[PDB]
Amino acid sequence: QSPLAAYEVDDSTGYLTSDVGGPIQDQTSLKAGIRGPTLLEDFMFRQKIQHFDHERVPERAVHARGAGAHGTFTSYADWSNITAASFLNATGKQTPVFVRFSTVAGSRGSADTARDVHGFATRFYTDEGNFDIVGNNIPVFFIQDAIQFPDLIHSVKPRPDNEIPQAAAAHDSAWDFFSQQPSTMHTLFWAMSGHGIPRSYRHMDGFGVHTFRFVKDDGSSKLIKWHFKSRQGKASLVWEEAQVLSGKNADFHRQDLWDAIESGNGPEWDVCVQIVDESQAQAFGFDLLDPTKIIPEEYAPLTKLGLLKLDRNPTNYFAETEQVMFQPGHIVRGIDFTEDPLLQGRLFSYLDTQLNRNGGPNFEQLPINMPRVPIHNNNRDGAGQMFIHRNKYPYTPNTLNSGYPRQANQNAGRGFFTAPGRTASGALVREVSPTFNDHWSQPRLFFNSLTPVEQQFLVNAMRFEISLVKSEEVKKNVLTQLNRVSHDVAVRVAAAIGLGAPDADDTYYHNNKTAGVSIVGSGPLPTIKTLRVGILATTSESSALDQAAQLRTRLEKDGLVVTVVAETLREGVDQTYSTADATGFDGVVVVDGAAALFASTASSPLFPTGRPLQIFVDAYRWGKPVGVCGGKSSEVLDAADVPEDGDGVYSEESVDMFVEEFEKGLATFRFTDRFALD
Amino acid sequence: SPLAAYEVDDSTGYLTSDVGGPIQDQTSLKAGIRGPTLLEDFMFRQKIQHFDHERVPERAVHARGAGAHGTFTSYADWSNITAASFLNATGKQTPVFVRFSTVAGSRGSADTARDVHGFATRFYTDEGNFDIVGNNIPVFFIQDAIQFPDLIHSVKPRPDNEIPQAAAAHDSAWDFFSQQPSTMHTLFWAMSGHGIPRSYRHMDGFGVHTFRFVKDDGSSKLIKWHFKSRQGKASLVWEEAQVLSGKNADFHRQDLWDAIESGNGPEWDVCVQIVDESQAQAFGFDLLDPTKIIPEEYAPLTKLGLLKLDRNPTNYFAETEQVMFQPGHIVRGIDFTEDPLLQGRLFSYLDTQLNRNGGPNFEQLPINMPRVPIHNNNRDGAGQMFIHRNKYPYTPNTLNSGYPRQANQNAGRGFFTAPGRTASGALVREVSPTFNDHWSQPRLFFNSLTPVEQQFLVNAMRFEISLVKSEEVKKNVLTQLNRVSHDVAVRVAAAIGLGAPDADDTYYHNNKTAGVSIVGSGPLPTIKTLRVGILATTSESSALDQAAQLRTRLEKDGLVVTVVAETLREGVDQTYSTADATGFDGVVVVDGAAALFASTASSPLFPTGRPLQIFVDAYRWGKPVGVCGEVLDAADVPEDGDGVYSEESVDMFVEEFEKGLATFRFTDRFALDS
Amino acid sequence: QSPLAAYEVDDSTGYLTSDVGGPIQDQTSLKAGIRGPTLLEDFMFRQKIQHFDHERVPERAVHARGAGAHGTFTSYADWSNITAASFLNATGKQTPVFVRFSTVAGSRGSADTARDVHGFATRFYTDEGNFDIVGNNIPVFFIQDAIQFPDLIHSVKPRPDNEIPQAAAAHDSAWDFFSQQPSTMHTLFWAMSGHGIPRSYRHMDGFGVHTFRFVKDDGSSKLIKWHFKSRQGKASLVWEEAQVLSGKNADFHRQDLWDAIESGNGPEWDVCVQIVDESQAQAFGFDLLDPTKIIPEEYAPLTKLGLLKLDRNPTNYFA
Ligand code: HDD
Ligand code: HDD
Ligand code: HDD
Ligand SMILES: [Ca+2]
Ligand SMILES: [Ca+2]
Ligand SMILES: [Ca+2]
Ligand SMILES: [Ca+2]
Ligand SMILES: [Ca+2]
């Protein structure tokens, strides 16, 4: 049973009714005569059409495009030695969760595979209240003060005269903002890396970004960072793949997640923290209140608290995924805020914005937002009020309700409490802390920590986007900021856009590196289960279908998702060449019985000219494992200009030997030697 | 019940947020003990955001009202006249919720304004919710729903200064009545005692429109709904209503609440008039015209079942403020008619709930939910509380095996339009000439009132029209009233210093009809719940003894007794300072309190002359009054008076007084025109 | 002409139109025959009734019952010696105002003459932005922390099972809260005095209640209290009179104000402050941050800043 089974409505049987249970029809209007006008007294028509007319709600102001699933969090230990948080207070303690992943800039119909920051928002339905960690797949944020959020978001969203371009920072306004607001450099470098185009929601991490506090029942506190570390491994698309995939399958990430859960491959993350003392706020060479900075893992290692597993898809997307209303204000005893001016302002935004989405104040009553423990408070009325409150004296202090509900605090009722060592001192100021002023060292730290091909991909992303900026003042200003992180980056980017990079400014240049931020560097994937193999076959040769069937059995044994492609559907063929694309596969195999489909003269009314070969070629050029199974590889590899001796290029007669080799190629995931370097 | 499932108990436990996190809510989080409040105080903001958003728009009409739960019980299997499931078996019980209301006043306006009153009943039937959205007056002001904003704008406050509240006593309203002669019939009802009912329990309910009863063979008859009070018909007098407006704006809602808590839940016989389709234009008017009644002489009432209200709400806002009635809530066995007022209502009540609820899922509110399964392809919308398992919500489908199934006359107990219904003719914005007699039935109503009732109606018109500033509107009002009755126009004209126009006898007649008079409806069938004020004193132990003896003799018979004295103690319920004659249906002075009634009497504990003014007001307003055990001389009240009691004995005082409570009003105390 | 003349719509001439300017009728529904059913294609009907169906907005959560007027504020001096405020920077400088007066507990159709605290909310449409002083006719408030406001208001508003009683603190819940929350005593005594039943909005004062700051252009600050002193005089009803007036004329205060303006007797207040140093926050025997306390005038006299005069009634109450 779903955790929301009490709210489910079954329509597998029965006669149509109105919303008030009156049996009706809904297929023909009531008319004055068989060719007559429709009657106002047709309530069947008007209740159905009113409902339809009002189906839509405002999309989220940011993160409008996303997808969610149910699962379970399991604690690895009793963490009462660092936090009073009930959901962390025992080894094996289980708490239901709901997670939504998202992009940031695009509207709710935009492509999953846009280049962007991604959301990773987790609700823990704890036995002491709902606790939300509203995170991103990038551990740092663009800006240092919440009051700037509309500036950032206006600049990266479409230009407001014509609403162009969708789901993209590749326009003047965005790069104007980045180059005028240098705090943006750290997140910008992350977004221009493969972290901007993750392979799936399952192949990315989650970060709380802000420093938070863990608070013990004795009132002592520690400073923490949340890290959700993918047990699937880290992987990226390449940009020229992501662009085609945005058109061929705008739903790629939500389909990948849905399919993984349905196949019993529900994705997993270790929920981890960095834990440091209050005295270390300004010990690591930056301010822990500054959300543009990471704590390098060399300074503070990750502690694994527990397992997050997503294993149940929603029943109704709108009701569960569209309506889930996360808040960092959803906090529990044992956790506290910090004076990070970005986190501080968020606490206001997420309570207010639900009024816009829900249209009224009772949004916590929606099934997906309800807690799994009793609610005792004097909140009342409001549009859409579902509860029927018995307590006729909803004020404190009272005698006529015997003093209930009772106040909860540090000493009674397991109340939330502010960390009691927290203080404030000084002038009431609209001033930025000078401790926040180094906007360039950590972007350089990140860039330094990427592999050479990874550095090239980041340069190439900047070359792509900045070449689309029309303004020559903005392009020059961008090169001024990039040059403060890396003169080499500025020179390489400047080469694509026909400007000269400004002279080196070495104030913030350094050669330090940090582990765990590189994708290319994180080694082969720990599992290839769920990865997608396209087998290109033909109906023109019964032996090509036999090769494909033998390949399927052997690949499916290992938990790969196999698609057999041919000219037309039949038993054992999943997909036509017409609907197939290399963006649909993590590796491509041609059965040598189909080699004739790869000829330059090959033509069919059943698929676009050159489609079989284009699938193989795109897969090779995008770095995927590719091969020909059966022993006759020359005709295909030569048509594709693919060298038989290439890394991640497989040619074997033996199906078993083909699959053993090819499976190592899928774990490698990308063959980076196929990309040119400056 | 959807209601039982959503009840929230806060009789124990620690305070939590709406997401179950234990919190406090009495002190703001601050930067130091004398410091500014922090934005990160989520406890503060969630509490104050909820408070800031508590209010919803009041209803566009009938904003002021009160509701209760109960049961409807069928007297029979009515299959012979309707397919309606709630009427298909002797003793069949259906839960109900009723809301009673005024019309013009906003949410906080007085119950005892002079107005039309709502009487809206939801039957939570086993074939869907069925609402009869009625009033206490059987005819409506206008003949086409498109005119409703014109009527309501005219009766509601003038829109430059929003004056006056809950009152038709202003130029705009009487401008409308005089220019729109269809208004005359309801205007005469509202100017009668029906404008100021004694309680919701002492008025009837009417569907107003002709509806149809439709059998499972497809045949139809025309019907009128009448809910006939078992408590009897009773009114206030106008002065009393005005004082009550100030002393207790909650009088009708308190009366209803208290009757239910005391086990005196009000009852009505749910009745219909039934006539054949061929009789639509047989009674001298059009049954599509909502300004006309069928005289009971032409079509008697058939009793279908018992409506009883016997449980108060748990949360007023969630149940009473949020109940969203609709004539569109119809069930198989009932159909509409081509009454142009009913026709347009059907649109209004679906649309307006979007304004009140702020989103389209208002039928999901517990008070709006049915008591049977919902099966349909309505989806999404703000505030969606369901999780629909059918992922193919379209018809026709194969992917959900063709469910839900279409319901119609043949199968699934579908609603169906009466299959004898037709339309013929041009597409017109034309009024039927059959609707054009605006004056005969107002005169029938006026003729059917007793002489003192006719005087009260003339005096209500004298009161309101005298407050009309425009001499031209007042003349136009007399022109219209004169077409109903020259005598009424002459008597009204005398109060405002104008001459009545010459008699215009076109619509004059001397016909009468039973069952519309209050004064004529005879003694109340029960005195239970009626209020007796016993005026006593703490001075004399004999006065308190006398009051306690009367108390036991009257409470025996189900009377709500208030003993009044200078100060509270054991046996005294109320001080003279808080007491008023509008609080009582009868007033008894114990002779031991004689000293309080002298003109010389004064106290810092109550206003000068309060005890005598309660007795004198009760007398002037027609109520049974008496002394048990000087007082009558002070009050200038004659001992021989009808409804004036003077007994040394408590037993014989009471036996006599209780006959007076049943009589209810002594109308010989009101002056008549010569 | 009104300060809002640019937004006015004249209907003293012309033919009925839809909201998009199409001439129409609005007195008979379109029907399939003269005794027929109403047609869905009747857009004249639906646009008109849709508008009607959606006329209402939520009443204010408190102070739902009230009435307003336009007028003018005129500064008596250049107050740059104590504040940078532009509306106070020159003798004779005029700023348009709008004021709304109100009760607190009653819903928008409740009687003006209920016993209650009253609102006095003033907008100054200044040449450096709108400045509102949202005050009451009593200088002290029931509670010392905004987080308690729903507690106070739930207790004073009708009991939530039956919504009784209207516009009145005369019920168990209110006196339960007063007796358990002793901060309430000062405002309670004011509300139980004639200040709870003023003769008119014109015969009551306005108070900011809180200590605010006046800030000079040089950055220095002083602590102030706002006091709007009635030029009409202070006057009350007696309680028995108020109870009868509630029934005989629920609109008494709004009519009194409307009529005073139409007769050329637009009400006036001297807009005054008490001015004390920051060092005097705890000097008077109580804390100036505590909204349950007044500064006795014997400790800090009133300085007259300017004249507030209300002299124009609204054109559309709702708008
Ligand atoms: C001051 C405003 C502001 C700031 C500074 C941020 N956000 Fe935010 N965010 C919002 C204002 C907001 C919002 C407008 O309140 C949204 C839109 C929908 C919602 O519920 O909240 C939101 C949505 C939103 C979602 C989507 C949740 C879901 O799937 O429904 C995620 C994952 C984040 N944000 C994450 C972040 C992170 C990791 C930030 C910086 C560390 C951040 N936001 C800063
Ligand atoms: C064309 C519009 C229109 C017309 C002609 C009428 N009404 Fe109506 N009425 C409404 C439009 C409306 C409304 C605006 O839709 C309301 C306000 C709140 C609601 O639910 O519906 C309403 C409320 C309302 C209520 C209050 C229900 C409750 O307690 O919540 C009652 C009892 C009635 N009406 C009764 C009548 C009767 C007996 C009428 C004539 C026979 C009538 N109305 C004509
Ligand atoms: C924490 C909430 C809160 C607190 C502590 C107060 N109020 Fe308030 N008040 C509101 C929350 C509110 C509100 C809910 O926000 C209202 C309802 C309508 C509106 O615009 O604001 C309001 C309305 C309102 C109005 C009506 C304005 C109008 O005519 O439209 C006045 C005069 C006051 N208040 C005056 C005060 C005074 C003098 C207070 C104490 C010194 C006070 N309020 C405390
Ligand atoms: Ca742009
Ligand atoms: Ca990469
Ligand atoms: Ca008027
Ligand atoms: Ca109470
Ligand atoms: Ca006084």
Residue numbers in the entry:
A (entry chain D): 20 to 697
B (entry chain A): 21 to 649, 654 to 698
C (entry chain C): 20 to 338
Question: Could you give the paper's own sentences about this structure?
Answer:
Catalase (CATPO) from the thermophilic fungus S. thermophilum is a clade 2 enzyme consisting of four subunits, each with a molecular weight of 80 kDa. In large-subunit catalases the gate and small cavity are formed by Arg134, Glu484 (CATPO numbering) and a loop of four residues (Gln185, Ala186, Ala187 and Thr188 in CATPO). The highly conserved four-residue loop located directly above the hydrophobic lower part of the main channel in large-subunit catalases is thought to act as a gate allowing access of H2O2 to the lower part of the main channel, while reducing water access.
The T188A variant was selected because it has a similar catalase k cat value to CATPO. When comparing the crystal structures of CATPO and its three variants, some differences can be noted. The first is the absence of the polar contact between Glu484 and Thr188 in the three variants. However, the water molecule (W11) to which Thr188 forms a hydrogen bond was retained in all variants. The fact that their catalytic activities are similar and that both contain d-type heme groups is consistent with this structural similarity. Catalases contain either heme b or heme d (an oxidized form of heme b) in their active centre. As can be seen in Fig. 2, the recombinant wild-type CATPO enzyme and its E484D and T188A variants have absorption peaks at 590 and 715 nm, indicating that these enzymes contain a d-type heme as a prosthetic group. However, the turnover numbers increased for the E484A (sixfold), E484I (fourfold), T188D (threefold), T188F (fourfold) and T188I (fourfold) variants, while they did not change significantly for the E484D and T188A variants. Although the T188A mutation did not result in a significant change in the catalytic activity, overall it can be concluded that despite their distance from the active site, Glu484 and Thr188 have an indirect effect on the catalase enzyme by influencing both the secondary phenol oxidase activity and the nature of the heme cofactor.
